[PDB]
Amino acid sequence: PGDGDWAAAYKKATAALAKLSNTDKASIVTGVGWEKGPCVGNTAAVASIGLPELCYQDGPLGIRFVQNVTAFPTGIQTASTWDISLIYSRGLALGQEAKALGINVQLGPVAGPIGKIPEAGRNWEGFSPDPYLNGLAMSNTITGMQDAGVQACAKHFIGNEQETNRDTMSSNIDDRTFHELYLWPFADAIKANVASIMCSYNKFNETYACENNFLTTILKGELDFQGFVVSDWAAQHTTIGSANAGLDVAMPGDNFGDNYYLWGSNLLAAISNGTVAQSRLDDMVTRILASWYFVGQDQGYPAVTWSSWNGGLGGPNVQADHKQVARAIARDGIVLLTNKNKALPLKKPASLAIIGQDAIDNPAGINSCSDRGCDTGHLAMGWGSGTADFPYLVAPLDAITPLAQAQGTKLVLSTTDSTSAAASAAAAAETAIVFITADSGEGYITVDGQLGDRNSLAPWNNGTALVQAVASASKNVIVVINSVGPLILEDILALSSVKAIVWAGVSGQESGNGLADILYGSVSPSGKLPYTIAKQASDYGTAIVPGDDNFPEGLFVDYRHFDQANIQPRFEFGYGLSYTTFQYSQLTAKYSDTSAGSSTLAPGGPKGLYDIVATVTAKVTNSGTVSGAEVAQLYIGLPGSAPASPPKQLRGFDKISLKPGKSGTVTFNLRRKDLSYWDTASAQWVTPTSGEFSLYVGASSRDIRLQGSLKCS
Ligand SMILES: *[C@@H]1O[C@H](CO)[C@@H](O)[C@H](O)[C@H]1NC(C)=O
Ligand SMILES: *[C@@H]1O[C@H](CO)[C@@H](O)[C@H](O)[C@H]1NC(C)=O
Ligand SMILES: *[C@@H]1O[C@H](CO)[C@@H](O)[C@H](O)[C@H]1NC(C)=O
Ligand SMILES: *[C@H]1O[C@H](CO)[C@@H](O)[C@H](O)[C@@H]1O
C-alpha cells in the first residue's frame, strides 16, 4: 500500500476509511443499479467523508450520451499518428471535458483488446496489436486525462480479443505471450499511475476475469497496482468469488437493472458468515478512495447536473477548443497507401466526381443510429459503448465543396453506393474520388448480420464493387477508405485506373477537414499503419474462434507473424507514404547504463524495468520538394541467447517534421524492459547479457534503412 507515487493518497484514504461504517463501505464498492444514477455507473455519496456520488462514464473517445461534448478520433486513428504529443493532447482534452461535467472516472483508454484478430469488433477503440506502440499510447493518454483531473480506467483486463461469445468463452494464454504481448500495455498503464482498471467479460484460463485471482496476483502483486479494479458491466458472477479474487467495484451493481446486488448487503453477509474477510472490503475502499485522492478530486470537483438517460441534457457546453486536436489527429493519422505520379495532392482539376454514401453525412442524422449502430453515410466512429454523440460531423463533401468551388472545379455527385450511378458520374469528370468503408463494434449490436465482429476483411456496403464501377469509367481514380481495421485491398489494387488510395481511418467529428487538409495538399500525410494489410485473410494466422481461444500463435501476432513465417504483406505494419521522400543516415547506439537495475517493486513492476539503459539516434533528411513529417521506427532483434522470438519488435518511434532538403535527428530511448524477455523458467523478466541486440531503423517494419547492434553489456 502506497508504493510509487501513492503514499500521500493512501494516507488520506486510510484516514477516511477509519470514519466509515460497514454499510458506508458496502455502498462505496457496490454500484447503485443500472440507470438508477445519472452516469453509466454510480456509487452512493458518503457525506461523512465528503465523497460524492461517484460518476463512471463511457467512453474512450469522448463523453457518451451527454450533449455538447467533443467526438474525438478513435483510439486506432490516434495510434496511427504515431505522435505522442497529439496522443497526450487528446487525453488532456477528454479529461478536461469529463471533469467539467463532474465525471469522476472516464472509462478508457483501451489496452485490451490489442486487436490480435483483425476482424474483431472493438479493435478501433484500442491502440494496435503492437504492444510497444499500444503502451506509449496508453501512457500518454492516461497522463493527459489524469493531468486534467479525471481518473482514467484502463480496460478490458484481459484476453477479450473478440466480441463473439465474449461473455462465455475462455482465453487461455501461455505465460510468455501473456507478459510480452497482452499484459505489456497494462503494465505501461500502471506505471503511468492509472487510477483504475476494468476487468473483462471473458473467462481467462477458464475462470471469468472478474472472478479470477489474477487481479490480485498479476495486477496488484506483480505489477503493484495501487488503484482499484472495476467490473465490466454485469461481469461480476458471484459474491464471494469476485471479492476474494480482488475486484473492488461492482458495476452497474445489479444485473443490468434487475435490482439484485451480489455485493451490497450480500457482501456484508459474506463477511458476517466468514467467507470474505473484513480486510478485503477495507482494502477495496482504501483503493477506491486512494485513486480519488490521488487525482485530487476530493477538493473542488464539479457536480453532475445532467443525465445519461434524458437525452444527455442539463450540463454545460464543455467543447472548449478541443476540435483543434480532433482535427490534427483526423489529419495526421491518415495513411497514404498508393499515389501514382503524384495523383495527389489535387491541383486545380477541371472536374471531380464524388462517389459513395461515405462522402456525406447520414441523411437521417449523424446521431440517428443508437450507439452509432449502423454504417450509413460518413463513417467516423464504430459502434457500442465506445461512442459519443457528434456535435457536428464534417463529411468529406462538406470540406471538399468550398475548396473545389474556389478552384472552379465542377463537381459531379453520386453520393449513394449505386454502381450504375457511380460509373455514370465517373465518366463525366476528369477525376473520380470514391469513398468506401468498413465498420464494426461491440458485441451487443448486430449490423449487416455482424454481431460486433466483422465476418470478413472485405469492404462493407459493396465497396469493392463500387470502386470497380468507378474504375471502369475513369482513367483517374482516388480511393478514400474509412475503416475500423485491416481490409484486403487486392481487388482494388488490380485496377489500373486507381491512382491513389487514402487510408483515412475513423476519425471523429473533424474527419472531413482532416481529409481535405491532405487531399488538397495543405499538409503532407504523415500517418503510418498500426496494423498489417495482408494480401489474403488467412495470412494473419488468427481468426474469430467459435469456442475457447488457446492462443496457439503465441507471440506471433500481426507483423511478428508475417516476419516469422516469411509472408509478404501488401502494406506492412508501420508503412505510410508522404508527398515527399526521406533519407536516413548516421546511426548511433550507446548503452548509457550497463549496471544492474533496481529490484524494488513499484507500480509497473520492478523499478529497474523502466530505467533508460540505452539510446539510439539517426539523421533523417527530407530528400524531396515539399515539407513533410516522417515517423522513424526502431525494431530490435534479440540475441541467440534469448528464446525464440519475433525477428523484429518495435521498441522506438519518433516523428520529425522537415522542410524540403532539411535534416534532423531522431532519438529512441530504450528502457531495460525494451531489451528483455519473459523467462518462464525463472518467472521473471530477463535482460540478455551476451551476444548483441540487432537494431533496425527505418520507415516501416520492412523499409529498414539502417542497421547496427548493441553489445549486451
Ligand atoms: C494460464 O494457463 C497457462 C497454461 O496452463 C499457465 O501456465 C499460465 O500461467 C496461466 N496464467 C495465469 C493463471 O495467470
Ligand atoms: C455467506 O454469505 C454469502 C452472501 O450472501 C452467501 O452466498 C453464502 O452462501 C454464505 N455462506 C455460508 C456458508 O453461509
Ligand atoms: C449546447 O450548448 C449551446 C451553447 O451554450 C446551447 O445553446 C445549446 O442549447 C446546448 N445544447 C444542448 C442540447 O444542451
Ligand atoms: C483529376 O485529378 C487527378 C489527381 O490530381 C489528376 O491526376 C487527373 O488528371 C485529374 O485532373
The experimental resolution of this structure, in angstroms, equals 1.9
Choosing from 179, 205, 207, 219 the residue with most ligand 1 atoms within 8 A of its CB, the one to mutate for a pocket test is 205
Same domain as 415, residue 474: yes
Among 83, 232, 389, 517, the active-site one is: 232
**Ligand number, closest to the Cα atom of 314:** 3
Residue nearest ligand 3's atom 12 by CA: 67
The count of structural domains within the chain is: 3
- Can you give 290-323 as a three-state secondary structure string? HHHHHCCCCCCCCCCCCCCCCCCCCCCCCCCCCH
Furthest C-alpha separation in the chain: 81
Residue nearest ligand 4's atom 6 by CA: 343
Same domain as 28, residue 5: yes
Same domain as 341, residue 240: no
Choosing from 158, 174, 176, 548 the residue with most ligand 1 atoms within 8 A of its CB, the one to mutate for a pocket test is 174
Same domain as 339, residue 258: no
Q: Is 238 in the pocket of ligand 3 (CB under 6 A)?
A: no
Give residue 708's region: left, alpha or beta (phi > 0; psi -120 to 50): beta
Q: Could you list the residue range(s) of the whole structural domain that residue 608 is in?
A: 582-713
User: Is-contact 470 423, C-beta < 8 A?
Assistant: yes
- CATH number for position 537: 3.40.50.1700
Same domain as 632, residue 497: no
- 307: in domain: no
Same domain as 586, residue 565: no
How far, in Å, CA of 222 to CA of 496, rounded?
55
Residue 514 C-alpha to ligand 4 middle, in angstroms?
A: 20
- 312: in domain: no
Same domain as 330, residue 216: no
Q: Which residues contact 188 (CB under 8 A, 6 or more apart)?
A: 134, 135, 136, 138, 139, 604
What are 436's strand-pairing partners? 481
- DSSP-derived secondary structure for 643-673: PS--S-EEEEEEEEEE-TT-EEEEEEEEEGG
How far, in Å, CA of 38 to CA of 46, rounded?
17
User: Is-contact 276 243, C-beta < 8 A?
Assistant: yes
Q: Which residues contact 531 (CB under 8 A, 6 or more apart)?
A: 115, 118, 128, 129, 485, 486, 558, 573
How far, in Å, CA of 674 to CA of 610, rounded?
9
Q: Classify strands 601-602 and 663-671 as parallel, antiparallel or unpaired.
A: unpaired
Query: Which of 578, 581, 582 has the alpha carbon at shortest distance from 524?
Result: 578
Same domain as 387, residue 248: no
Residue 201 C-alpha to ligand 2 middle, in angstroms?
A: 24
Same domain as 144, residue 62: yes
- 436: in domain: yes
Other CB atoms within 10 Å distance of the CB of residue 708: 15
This entry's atomic model was obtained through X-ray
- Can you give 501-560 as a three-state secondary structure string? EEECCCCCCCHHHHHHHHHCCCCCCCCCCCCCECCCHHHHCCCCCCCCECCCCCCCCCHH
Q: Is 274 in the pocket of ligand 2 (CB under 6 A)?
A: no
DSSP code for 361: -
- CATH number for position 3: 3.20.20.300
How far, in Å, CA of 530 to CA of 608, rounded?
29
Same domain as 456, residue 525: yes
Choosing from 273, 276, 280 the residue with most ligand 2 atoms within 8 A of its CB, the one to mutate for a pocket test is 273
Cell representation of residue 161:
480479443
Residue nearest ligand 2's atom 10 by CA: 270
Query: What is the chain's length?
Result: 713
How far, in Å, CA of 526 to CA of 27, rounded?
49
How far, in Å, CA of 673 to CA of 687, rounded?
8
Cell representation of residue 42:
454510480
Same domain as 465, residue 346: yes
**β-sheet with 410-414: strand ranges across:** 335-339, 498-503, 477-483, 431-438, 351-355, 410-414
Backbone angles phi, psi at 352, to 5 degrees: -145, 120
How far, in Å, CA of 655 to CA of 639, rounded?
28
Helix (H, G, I), strand (E, B) or coil at 589: strand
- 557: in domain: yes
Chain centre distance of CA 179: 19
Backbone angles phi, psi at 142, to 5 degrees: -65, -45
Same domain as 661, residue 575: no
User: Is-contact 186 157, C-beta < 8 A?
Assistant: yes
Q: Is 430 in the pocket of ligand 4 (CB under 6 A)?
A: yes
Task: Assess whether 232 carries a catalytic annotation.
Answer: yes
- 314: in domain: no
User: Is-contact 100 303, C-beta < 8 A?
Assistant: no
Cell representation of residue 159:
484476453
